[PDB]
Scaffold this active site. Structure first.
Site, PDB file in Angstrom:
ATOM      1  N   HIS B 104      27.550  55.256   1.155  1.00 34.47           N
ATOM      2  CA  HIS B 104      27.873  54.059   0.353  1.00 34.47           C
ATOM      3  C   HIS B 104      27.118  52.794   0.760  1.00 34.47           C
ATOM      4  O   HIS B 104      27.423  51.703   0.271  1.00 34.47           O
ATOM      5  CB  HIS B 104      29.375  53.768   0.339  1.00 34.47           C
ATOM      6  CG  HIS B 104      30.212  54.971   0.083  1.00 34.47           C
ATOM      7  ND1 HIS B 104      30.586  55.841   1.088  1.00 34.47           N
ATOM      8  CD2 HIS B 104      30.721  55.476  -1.064  1.00 34.47           C
ATOM      9  CE1 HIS B 104      31.289  56.830   0.564  1.00 34.47           C
ATOM     10  NE2 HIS B 104      31.378  56.638  -0.741  1.00 34.47           N
ATOM     11  N   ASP B 205      21.396  76.107  44.141  1.00 36.30           N
ATOM     12  CA  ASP B 205      20.981  77.485  44.272  1.00 36.30           C
ATOM     13  C   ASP B 205      19.513  77.687  44.636  1.00 36.30           C
ATOM     14  O   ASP B 205      18.648  77.878  43.779  1.00 36.30           O
ATOM     15  CB  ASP B 205      21.268  78.253  42.998  1.00 36.30           C
ATOM     16  CG  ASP B 205      21.286  79.734  43.232  1.00 36.30           C
ATOM     17  OD1 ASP B 205      22.218  80.405  42.743  1.00 36.30           O
ATOM     18  OD2 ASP B 205      20.378  80.247  43.896  1.00 36.30           O
ATOM     19  N   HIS B 208      18.381  82.031  44.809  1.00 34.16           N
ATOM     20  CA  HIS B 208      17.828  82.860  43.714  1.00 34.16           C
ATOM     21  C   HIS B 208      16.314  82.769  43.610  1.00 34.16           C
ATOM     22  O   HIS B 208      15.676  83.660  43.064  1.00 34.16           O
ATOM     23  CB  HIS B 208      18.457  82.487  42.367  1.00 34.16           C
ATOM     24  CG  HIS B 208      17.824  81.305  41.708  1.00 34.16           C
ATOM     25  ND1 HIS B 208      18.002  80.011  42.160  1.00 34.16           N
ATOM     26  CD2 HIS B 208      17.028  81.219  40.613  1.00 34.16           C
ATOM     27  CE1 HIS B 208      17.338  79.184  41.364  1.00 34.16           C
ATOM     28  NE2 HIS B 208      16.724  79.894  40.435  1.00 34.16           N
ATOM     29  N   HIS B 213      12.575  84.208  40.561  1.00 30.79           N
ATOM     30  CA  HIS B 213      11.272  83.632  40.188  1.00 30.79           C
ATOM     31  C   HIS B 213      10.090  84.347  40.861  1.00 30.79           C
ATOM     32  O   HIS B 213       9.002  83.794  40.929  1.00 30.79           O
ATOM     33  CB  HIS B 213      11.235  82.147  40.519  1.00 30.79           C
ATOM     34  CG  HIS B 213      12.200  81.325  39.719  1.00 30.79           C
ATOM     35  ND1 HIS B 213      12.096  81.181  38.346  1.00 30.79           N
ATOM     36  CD2 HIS B 213      13.295  80.620  40.091  1.00 30.79           C
ATOM     37  CE1 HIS B 213      13.089  80.427  37.911  1.00 30.79           C
ATOM     38  NE2 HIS B 213      13.820  80.058  38.952  1.00 30.79           N
ATOM     39  N   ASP B 362      15.059  82.441  34.473  1.00 33.55           N
ATOM     40  CA  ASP B 362      16.452  82.102  34.704  1.00 33.55           C
ATOM     41  C   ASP B 362      17.338  82.460  33.531  1.00 33.55           C
ATOM     42  O   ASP B 362      18.550  82.637  33.715  1.00 33.55           O
ATOM     43  CB  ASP B 362      16.589  80.583  34.914  1.00 33.55           C
ATOM     44  CG  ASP B 362      16.139  80.094  36.274  1.00 33.55           C
ATOM     45  OD1 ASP B 362      15.388  79.089  36.324  1.00 33.55           O
ATOM     46  OD2 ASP B 362      16.575  80.558  37.331  1.00 33.55           O
TER      47      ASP B 362
HETATM   48  S1  FES Z   1      29.148  53.811   3.784  1.00 28.61           S
HETATM   49 FE1  FES Z   1      30.717  55.266   3.176  1.00 28.61          FE
HETATM   50  S2  FES Z   1      30.596  56.925   4.670  1.00 28.61           S
HETATM   51 FE2  FES Z   1      29.192  55.376   5.357  1.00 28.61          FE
HETATM   52 FE   LIG Z   2      15.642  79.159  38.740  1.00 27.07          FE
END
Ligand code: FES
Ligand SMILES: [Fe+3]
Ligand code: FES
Ligand code: FES
Ligand SMILES: [Fe+3]
Ligand SMILES: [Fe+3]
Lengths: 193, 447, 193, 447, 193, 447
Positions: B104, B205, B208, B213, B362
């Protein structure tokens, strides 16, 4: 043809690429490009990554996939980095990625992934200045299946430059992809588009 | 589930029920007791430096607009129209004096105020009280050396106090280095894991690394590569682990300034960090100057993580119990040459971004561990975090916080989950404080 | 070949189209049609909608996409409207849609959408009577990405008629698509197939 | 959530909690208190005119078969086999004397009766009581000038009484015009919005038109085009708004007979509607004849909407709180020339169908407003519907219902949600009536 | 080119197929294969199953689609059946499936299904020994839509052998597909890939 | 929902509430009272014959590793690491001495024991109690002539007792034939149906065959083809139906040894089965030798089904109330020639596998019946299973169990759902027994 002042949604970069293919068409070149790309896709699909590097990728390659930040159509003031590099690789960097794929301790590669690539909309045009340089555009659908029920499908347009190299074989010297999905829904982008 | 009474995390954070990574009712409860209560990373000054600059960010599952005001401050607002609830801003970043709703046409300022309503005089006359119709504002927005965090809970401790003992470890890099900038935009990827899975992995961690890796270490060409396949264990005091009252924690790997970066960056970075350390020895002392050029794997509770030196900066944005949206930025030192800045940013994404080869190692770990938390026989099972228990200290003369003086352990898991239990079972910050009055004693038991 | 009395699942319309392509094949025409469609798809993918109208769409065009109501295979009594027109546009109507896409107050177009089209299975045959008229059949996968995590993928077969127009350029005079998914799961059908 | 006590809609329908567009528990509760209780659109005589003709339709999340009987009546039945529960009919429309289940072959008549069971004598002997095994029948099926509605609740008011004061406004077009036909089949599209989002928009939202539809107005070539970008506000008594006891309501835009249609239809339609109005002046009076050729944006509570003149007819079929399946038909006047009928039907789909360029303007509004209703910080926020409050009347000498004598306002939202609250907090029709004994007084407060 | 000792992820079978297409390319054959497959896909898409059998499928055909059990990349001891046959049909068996599709009591076929196939990455090479035998490789995306909101999409690579038969028409004598998704998420695999 | 009191299944299993095929809360409750309590099919000796051989299998929604031990026994363990909960094994089958976790490298033996932890001495010292950290073991694992089943409930009856009266019918084929082997790997497909839909269909639904499978019978070229389109009803004592205490049941179609197989197998199979029957007459008597070569459609409660002779073996793996993952194997007789074994396996998949033309006939039936169970007006409706009620016997001199001496009926549905109600309303096996002390009397009422 394209006038970007009238065709409001078209980027200057995109309009420049239209121009390169709409003019001077060479049917034989289109067929050659189709062969090149189909063979490339085949090598990738069977995970022959070393063969791909050796047969399809030029030493001077730039392999780049970007993700562009979503900004307003009417934006004209904010000028910070528009994109990031998912990939921005030279030959050595591709090689590192290939070694990573082949390492027997790459646990994510067992059981073996399954790739299927669909290459379409191939266009080819010789570069105006570097008669050694061939511009190839193509679109890819890339299907990755693994671990029973993981399925990831990637979609992209590829702007490539290919040049004949040693032995006169045409090889990829530039690949550029502006990845169309901003937020990936495929777990990662760990595929070669 | 009665979160007042349910023991989700055992005493001293020694174990956690596996269901915490899969239970959707608990996820909804975390929205209230974790995400609506604690400090969450929004952005960096470097990303919204000028008046009117804005970004959108997640705070838990909510989306906010984070805007640089004319007076230089930053304010953040829910990205939701005050009229019929449409999302106001559809982009990730930009510059604007206000935001107009596409439904709106209501117009809001960058300061959140309702400034204009179409045909106000003819339709509403003087009946519309615009002063009461500004966008819903994030109560608290604070900075840590340019890193901007938000909190919906006005009762939260200041960000600096919230960082607690972790702040001391971050300051050499975040402050004494001259400052960091955040290089955007981030990579963004959804993973099928609970947000706590990567958060716990980054907070403490190191165990691991050599195994998970193995392939990246070996192939990658990086300083930590001796670890590939657990071929070798780190040395002596190769590092330490720390945790704090409010949950934040990190691992410290001494001198690893080039981090995960490829050999195409190791020499340059090792020169650059060593040069700066030399200058910092005189300003902050040798221990702190060394911390500056040491690799820190840190989680700022709850869901912001980072690898200093490597330059990886992450946000684990929660979607549902088995879905997280991962944001990945690069951090660079402001005084680095701009060509280095560029290469470092690409290298961060190269290793830990959407197509990050290290990150990929990962993923299965994070996804399956999270998903198994839904499986019937695993819900009531215990995830273990006892490594190093009974060897942590509090109040050390040199290194503050609850500290494990070893590179590999689970100290930081225990502190992360000591704080997590305290929050999940508390209705407000006062209760959290009451539940945390003996936090360090709890963490150091048996020592 | 097809006898629809034996091939029970085949519609008379479909059997008529098989016949037109199985007979008299002209390889050069197939290549021309491929070029035409690839170029069309490229213009659409970069959102050069005005260029598309100017270069690819004939003044006498009918651009039609139907959605057919699901009825019984054995139905022989109910004879009410079998379909509806998702699109049934003349040139002016396409122009209106193009202006709508380009209007700076088309709020849904910010941030900019990302389109990627995959055109395959191209067939081409000259019309028996209007030696100016070329029948082209092709299939399209159309990927639309927007707003971070919205991804919609469309799939369809296109029955086109193309005729040379001004400047002797071949342009689209009819496109017909019977959209295969009855209930759309892509938010809308606001894409040019 | 206790729906007996929860204030989802504030007094006088001035605001609604945002969660109503996202909460799945409330969605399930609506299945009971909204969809299983009220009148729902099924079909039109024009779509099942002959004996044996049938269509399938949704009623809430249920699917029914709606069949023209031999005696000319229409009956509707759940599309579910009485044996093991398989869906009986897999098509959308057809003509048949009965329906056979593909699982075990049970045969039901067009009247719902179980007529045959394979091998009845050999398997069941005389044990099967077929008389008790007819398809589950929709209790109530009634027509409003050919438009067929169903209701599962035998206690509901007759359809005519249910339309309440809205009936007076619909009659010029639905009855005095000579009658309407419904042109099928409908477009069908799923949107990620709550059913109430489009329902509220169609029942009383003229405020959004100039801004939301700026591009369509400008490009479209239509009679309401002066509104594009809120460049202009409607005139004087350019129209009115109305609402009724049972929730139905509409906006009235005087004389806008060509509606959303493109210039390729404006002259023809403006001639046709004006010609008919001239004839109706003598039969129903000038005010009602003008209403005939005036654009009505109406929702027949709960989830059936329409734009008369424009000829748009919608069903917002509920799937879950953030999913709705949108059905779009065209309505035409029976005495229009058949070529006009055709062009009008295409134009309805052109503007508001699956690829409807006007419809597309509305989608993001509907989707994000609905989705934001799930977000933690927005659940308890208030969606506003106070525009025009304190200026509505009841019992006007010329225009019945609760009426706002202005083209743009929120009168119809307030009545829609006054009825919605009354239903969600009531266990049956009697309770709804008890909760509605002062409905108009509630809507006109402060006036 | 491929050395599977170096290209660790490549199967011997896959490497053998690379070799057959990378050597001796015949552009005309590629075009012929494209026509053959596009026409095949068209017949299938319109559900002209009898026409498909009559015009496209050889009497000696083997039509096979396997699903391979997921095993470890480093597995070298477990030697039990690696796969199962989703399809492993001779001509008679295909005929039975076709009759099943056409039977008026095939209740699942009402309302009529909608198929759209996308054939890409076509490669063709003559067999070295049987000069009558043509190897064709192609990828397919197959979209099946039914009952309003059921949509299933299949992805696969096809290894075909085609031979000229009666009337000298080239017909399919072998199709082999190793289906890439282990656990199907399409309700069934009741489509002809 | 109070499962103690809710009548989901009526007395004598005559009807079931439709919601049982759609209600997610009930699905979760089944995880506890059906899947965690009863015997579930895992694998066959033929698939893990050697030491170290393993497969993964589902048990309800849980995943287990099923491993052949060095001593020849089989043990099964949850496929979840005892450390941080990562899925241990990512493949479907293999051979190994142990399993190493890809997250932190913990190594478990094929016997489930935690055998190694990286850097144990340096990190954990002597603090780690590995003896208490073995994989979570399936309490019970037993074999029925090579078919391996698991049960998480140590209180369950032995598998043989659990099969109850059904065992007598399976023995001719499973034991006296010389033994069966299971041909893998299975087909795997997800269907949008509740697991009970296919389970009930296979346990006792011969009524659907002629109509549902009309096209397959006609086209297929099989021994049961006279049934196509209900053109003909089976003869006299063409067969029988049976059910048992613990829920398992089957239909018996006398002499139908070639089953669903195409004519390309009918002569060969009819020769082979008749030849073996001749030999078995002397060993087990004529009735049992005939049962051997008679087609049995059986469900081993809850979710394992099969068609002997046809050789179809199914697992209906539950995912959620409207999602099931269907596993399809072939069963063959060990002494069949290996070329016959191959052709039979392909024929099983040809008819009932992922692209099984017979299976496809059943899908819409299973999917819509399940999905309709979620629809508001159908939740409280009654699915009927009264065919043949009042004609069943118990304690027959020749055929054991609750038996209906006719080929087509609903006897086996009633017994399946008599057991299902008893489980859903019981907290443990003792309660199930208490609820089942008059099971046969309940099933044979009115007879
Ligand atoms: S102006 Fe109506 S929902 Fe944003
Ligand atoms: Fe890692
Ligand atoms: S489910 Fe309809 S006849 Fe059995
Ligand atoms: S989760 Fe398995 S070793 Fe840590
Ligand atoms: Fe609108
Ligand atoms: Fe069946």
């Amino acid at each position: 043809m394209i006038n970007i002042q009238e065709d409001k949604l078209v980027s200057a970069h995109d309009a420049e690429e239209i121009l390169r293919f709409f003019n001077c068409h060479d049917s034989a070149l289109q067929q050659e490009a189709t062969t090149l790309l189909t063979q490339e896709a085949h090598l990738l699909d069977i995970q022959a990554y070393r063969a791909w590097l050796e047969h399809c990728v030029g030493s001077e390659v730039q392999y780049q996939v970007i993700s562009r930040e979503l900004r307003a159509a009417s934006e004209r003031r904010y000028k910070l980095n528009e994109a990031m590099n998912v990939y921005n690789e030279n030959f050595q960097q591709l090689k590192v990625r290939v070694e990573h794929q082949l390492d027997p301790q790459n646990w994510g590669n067992s059981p073996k992934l399954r790739f299927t690539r669909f290459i379409t909309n191939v266009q080819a045009a010789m570069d105006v200045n570097d008669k050694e340089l061939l511009h190839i555009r193509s679109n890819v659908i890339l299907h990755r299946a693994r671990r029973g029920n993981q399925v990831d499908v990637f979609y992209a347009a590829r702007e490539d430059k290919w040049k004949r190299g040693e032995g006169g074989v045409r090889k990829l010297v530039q690949r550029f992809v502006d990845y169309p999905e901003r937020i990936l829904q495929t777990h990662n982008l760990m595929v070669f588009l | 589930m009665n979160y007042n009474n349910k023991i989700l995390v055992s005493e001293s954070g020694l174990s956690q029920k596996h269901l915490i990574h899969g239970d959707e009712e608990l996820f909804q409860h975390e929205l209230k007791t974790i995400f609506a209560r604690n400090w969450l990373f929004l952005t960096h000054d470097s990303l919204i430096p000028a008046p009117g600059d804005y970004v959108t960010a997640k705070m838990g599952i909510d989306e906010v607009i984070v805007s640089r005001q004319n007076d230089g401050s930053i304010r953040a607002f829910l990205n939701v129209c005050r009229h019929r609830g449409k999302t106001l801003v559809s982009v990730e970043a930009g510059n604007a004096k206000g935001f107009v709703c596409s439904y709106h046409g209501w117009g809001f300022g960058s300061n959140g105020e309702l400034q204009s309503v179409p045909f106000e005089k003819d339709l509403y006359g003087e009946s519309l009280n615009k002063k009461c119709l500004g966008l819903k504002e994030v109560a608290r927005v604070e900075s840590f050396h340019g890193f901007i965090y938000g909190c919906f809970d006005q009762e939260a401790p200041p960000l600096m106090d919230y960082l607690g003992d972790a702040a001391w470890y971050l300051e050499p890099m975040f402050k004494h280095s001259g400052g960091l900038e955040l290089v955007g935009p981030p990579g963004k990827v959804v993973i099928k894991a609970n947000w706590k899975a990567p958060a716990e992995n980054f907070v403490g961690d190191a165990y691991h690394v050599g195994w998970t890796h193995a392939s990246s270490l070996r192939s990658g060409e990086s300083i930590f590569s001796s670890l590939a396949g657990n071929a070798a264990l780190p040395p002596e005091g190769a590092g330490l682990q720390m945790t704090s009252k409010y949950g934040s924690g990190m691992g410290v790997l001494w001198d690893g300034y080039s981090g995960v970066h490829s050999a195409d960056l190791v020499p340059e970075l090792m020169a650059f960090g060593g040069a700066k350390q030399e200058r910092l020895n005189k300003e902050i002392g040798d221990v702190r100057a060394r911390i500056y050029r040491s690799h820190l794997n840190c989680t700022v509770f709850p869901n912001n993580s980072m690898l200093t030196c490597s330059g990886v900066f992450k946000v684990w944005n929660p979607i549902d119990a088995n879905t997280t949206e991962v944001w990945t930025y690069a951090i660079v030192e402001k005084d680095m040459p701009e060509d280095l800045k560029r290469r470092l940013a690409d290298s961060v994404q190269r290793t830990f971004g959407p197509a990050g080869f290290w990150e990929s190692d990962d993923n299965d770990n994070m996804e399956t561990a999270s998903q198994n938390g839904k499986k019937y026989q695993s819900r009531d099972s215990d995830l273990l975090s006892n490594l190093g228990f009974g060897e942590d200290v509090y109040g050390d003369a040199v290194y503050p916080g609850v500290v494990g003086k070893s590179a590999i352990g689970e100290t930081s898991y225990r502190g992360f989950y000591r704080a997590y239990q305290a929050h999940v079972s508390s209705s407000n910050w006062a209760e959290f404080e009451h539940a945390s009055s003996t936090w360090h004693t709890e963490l150091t038991k048996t020592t």
